[PDB]
Amino acid sequence: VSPKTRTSNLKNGLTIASESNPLVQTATVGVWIDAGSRNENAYNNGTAHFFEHLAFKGTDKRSQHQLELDIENMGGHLNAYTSRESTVYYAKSFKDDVPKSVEILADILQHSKLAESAIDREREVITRELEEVNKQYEEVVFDHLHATAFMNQPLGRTILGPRENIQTITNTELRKFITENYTADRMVLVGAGAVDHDALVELAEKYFSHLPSSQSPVPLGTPIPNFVGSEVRLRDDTMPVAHIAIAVEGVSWTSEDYYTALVAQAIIGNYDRAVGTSRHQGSRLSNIVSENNLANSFQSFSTSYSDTGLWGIYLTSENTTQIDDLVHFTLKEWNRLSTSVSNLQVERAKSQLKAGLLLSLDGTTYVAEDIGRQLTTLGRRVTPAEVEAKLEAVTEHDVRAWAQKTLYDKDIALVGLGPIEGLYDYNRIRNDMSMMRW
């Protein structure tokens, strides 16, 4: 039984949340913000990601070089990432270097220069990033997947933004973005590892007390997405591996079906020919795929947002003449979540998940990421006892009912990249979303 997550607020409405571990000697402190690319419009799309670059380009006190030196002298590192709904800025350090790291984070968030010279310099760096994501096939597939599933909607936009915006982003719009979005009621200061909660609250009172509050404070993790059944094909005969994602509209963080969708996802599970144990997994799809050499890997996913989600599978295969079989067998395993699953699969998946949700948190950065994610999506850290109860409440009837309303005979978003000549047209893929025998 893990130590209790302590939570305090400041007057502005900044949440401080901590989980101490007296067995480690490092600490991860950082700021989780309930804001990301989705908060941009079409004209300033790319701003949030642009700011992330400039946050490390110098503040009103420390220059770019001084910033570098200060962190080098601390001994640990700083890291940041911007997603569609969430931005994170954290610092991993030694136990007693925590006050330094909180001070640096407070500086780069509140007091960043955003100097025209630096805007202009990064504008090329970010332009080069547009032509090099092209290599990260999983990311290419998932970005096209969001773009098509949420066609012409904010969740459909990329994080980098269009080339056009990169050339026209000004310090004015950068400043406007972080003034509107980086408000105290949207921010959580998180500490995990060798942190004292009371010490962290004091550091918050010292550095984050002059943060603006938003005019209308909504609760943390407050949001209408209209999913489009659709396909993007990026055929490239020169690539040896096909990458395919298939998804349906999934569940939000606060859906009542959140755990049901996780259990369903665990019934299909993951597979990777490179891992020794994968040929012995219990999942039916795993057995079909491994026996017939249909794929190098597959990974089931259930991505959530504040008001929607995507539930589906990502496949990679070199078997270019049997892509049809791979997709066919995958979707017939999904059909069985509607028609055939019983207590046998459901209780097996529950067993696997009860551990999986706890195992994931195996270092201070993972713990901080868990506290930060849960605080910015649900408004609270959910105790493992509550999570164990919600998983236990999932029955086979719940899984069947969920799959019959979410998967069965529903539109999919489909992205294929690589040698995908063998991937059939939309109708034949979508026809596998039901079974004529049932």
Add this chain to the structure above:
Amino acid sequence: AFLTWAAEPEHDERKKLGLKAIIVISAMLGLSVYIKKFKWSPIKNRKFIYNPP
């Protein structure tokens, strides 16, 4: 008229069955047009972006 009947005594029944066939076949034709268009729309609506390698 009598001789016409003698040549083709099925005449009355034949034309009534024809009326039923015309109605059913016409309806089936109309529905088959809707279904064909429904099934073909992903192909008809397909769009391309080409970026020469």
